[PDB]
Design a binder for this molecule. Structure first.
Ligand SMILES: O=c1[nH]c(=O)n([C@@H]2O[C@H](COP(=O)(O)OP(=O)(O)O)[C@@H](O)[C@H]2O)cc1-c1ccccc1
Ligand SMILES: O=c1[nH]c(=O)n([C@@H]2O[C@H](COP(=O)(O)OP(=O)(O)O)[C@@H](O)[C@H]2O)cc1-c1ccccc1
Ligand SMILES: CCCCCCCCO[C@@H]1O[C@H](CO)[C@H](O)[C@H](O)[C@H]1O[C@@H]1O[C@@H](C)[C@@H](O)[C@@H](O)[C@@H]1O
Ligand SMILES: CCCCCCCCO[C@@H]1O[C@H](CO)[C@H](O)[C@H](O)[C@H]1O[C@@H]1O[C@@H](C)[C@@H](O)[C@@H](O)[C@@H]1O
Ligand SMILES: [Mn+2]
Ligand SMILES: [Mn+2]
Lengths: 286, 289
């Protein structure tokens, strides 16, 4: 459940946080609306695990594996088992047009998988974009506390845990975390619902990893889908599809945490910069 | 109200946050449980003002002015009018044994004051400690219906710069000005295991000041009730914590991590501690007494 109040922790022994000696001096670790930006070295996972275990938190993870992308499921699920929310209750929701093609993956205790059969759109943009509709229409409200929504063409390489959980989060796109807002590939046509002008924008968030409480994720995905439908009626398709709309949404509804690109990376394209102490969730070659 | 969901903001023009060039590199700006530590430069007050105005946020500010401490009210209130939550709904709650002694102070629109008549304890320790009981009692009697957040402070203070909605969150504490740079073994926690407020030398995140804490009404109700109950247990065991209510506040916040922590910009004594470079603003400061 998501607790209504602060929980009470047991005695714990860990290093004292030092007010005058911050660990991360190389990156921004809080947004101007006072949401934390999650990097290695900013959190004590022992404290956070206690907080979330005491609420018996259940996390849902949605992933789409339509047409040839079913091939990515084996590695995605096997690595999630090693690295995603270990110790907490996890419900995987695998959306696919080929239920029989879902690999049998052995799950740890307290983890479950549901296979949701869905339509395969012809245009890859429509598959990517129509995730918003499918997530928004999809039982989660009675089953999980948080939803995490990710691409399938990925693997976990390192810890991704309850440090990310919060009412609404987006993830810094790995291609643009160091870029100025004028360079962001936001939709720039005022005719699109995803329009963001050159003098606005905080971050460029990646469409491949967002989430929050079930209620907030439902609102986000419903709003993105609606905006896409308006665009479609107006004869326009945003430059980066679902991601463009995600960015418009998070511009106007500020996320309560932002994840660093540790959580969404492509080592082939981008290497392993000093600023990334861990590479947690990374692109698989395709 | 406290809105159930994220609010939708209008178009705003402001400097872009830069991921690779943080403004504050000199201080910790987030706790290990991912609560912001609020320092000048960490927040854009225009964004926060929008978020909180859109929810028509009402902030209650409690202050005790028992016996001779009514003398502090005029400066406290006049300065609060200049600096505290300006632009938002505010409700001051003055707990006093002398209602007729509360100074007439002209208030801005959307701001009001209630005088709460309470008993005066003989021992200064009890006056300080019984604030927890009194706040908790009034949470049920008044605060839950009247305000969204409560901010609970000492009266022997004045506002000297902005104190606003950047502090609002479910539960917050404030880094005590005497110890923000100290190691946990130098914190003056209650060190006697017999006390409910006991914290051993190998525990503790911060030393929080008893003079400035707050949160949602429901969290403040829980904190103040818990602290009073701990103090009653101590009393029945014939023990009184070294720093009274502050000792219990520290025990409470160790075990119930605050969702924001305020830097000592929000609780300072300039005569005693000067003005270190790390403090770019002095917002709420001790009055000589
Ligand atoms: O045929 C698909 N089936 C499918 O299930 N997807 C889902 O959409 C996500 C986004 O598409 P990606 O190819 O991973 O997009 P990028 O990461 O921007 O390259 C995939 O991870 C996957 O979960 C995506 C595709 C697809 C196939 C070809 C081109 C674009 C998208
Ligand atoms: O006579 C009092 N009346 C009163 O209302 N108070 C309230 O308790 C608060 C804390 O006591 P302080 O004297 O400010 O304590 P310190 O900040 O530790 O000096 C005061 O701000 C005030 O709000 C405190 C006192 C008091 C009087 C003498 C000694 C200690 C406390
Ligand atoms: C420094 C600026 C110039 C260099 C920018 C380098 C990263 C570009 O990234 C693409 O960015 C697009 C938006 O502009 C979309 O999000 C696209 O899905 C993404 O590529 C996806 O994610 C990438 C990380 C790769 O995994 C790529 O194969 C994917 O197709
Ligand atoms: C570096 C360590 C050694 C030096 C520590 C210097 C500050 C000490 O501070 C006192 O600390 C106590 C707890 O240990 C209580 O909170 C007390 O109320 C407080 O004094 C109150 O607040 C102070 C800021 C002053 O305003 C003082 O006049 C007050 O009585
Ligand atoms: Mn992808
Ligand atoms: Mn005082």
């Amino acid at each position: 459940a998501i607790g209504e109040f602060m929980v009470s922790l047991p005695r714990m022994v860990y290093p004292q946080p030092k007010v005058l000696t911050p660990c991360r001096k190389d990156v921004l670790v809080v947004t101007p609306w006072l949401a934390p930006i999650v990097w290695e070295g900013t959190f004590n996972i022992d404290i956070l695990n206690e907080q979330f275990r005491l609420q018996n938190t259940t996390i849902g993870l949605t992933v789409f594996a339509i047409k040839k992308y079913v091939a990515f499921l084996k590695l995605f699920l096997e690595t999630a088992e090693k690295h995603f929310m270990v110790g907490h209750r996890v419900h995987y929701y695998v959306f696919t047009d080929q239920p029989a093609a879902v690999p049998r993956v052995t799950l740890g205790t307290g983890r479950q998988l549901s296979v949701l059969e869905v339509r395969a759109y012809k245009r890859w943009q429509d598959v990517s974009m129509r995730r918003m509709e499918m997530i928004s229409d999809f039982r989660f409200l009675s089953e999980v506390d948080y939803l995490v929504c990710v691409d399938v063409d990925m693997e976990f390489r390192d810890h991704v845990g309850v440090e990310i959980l919060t009412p609404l989060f987006g993830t810094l796109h790995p291609g643009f975390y160091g870029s100025s807002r004028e360079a962001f590939t936001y939709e720039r046509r005022p005719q699109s619902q995803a329009y963001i002008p050159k003098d606005e924008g905080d971050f460029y968030y990646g469409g491949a990893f967002f989430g929050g409480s079930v209620q907030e994720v439902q609102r986000l995905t419903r709003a993105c889908h609606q905006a896409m439908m308006v665009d479609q009626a107006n004869g326009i398709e945003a430059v980066w599809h679902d991601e463009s709309h995600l960015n418009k949404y998070l511009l106007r509804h500020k996320p309560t945490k932002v994840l660093s690109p540790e959580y969404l990376w492509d080592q082939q394209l981008l290497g392993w910069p000093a600023v990334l102490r861990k590479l947690r969730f990374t692109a698989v070659p395709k």
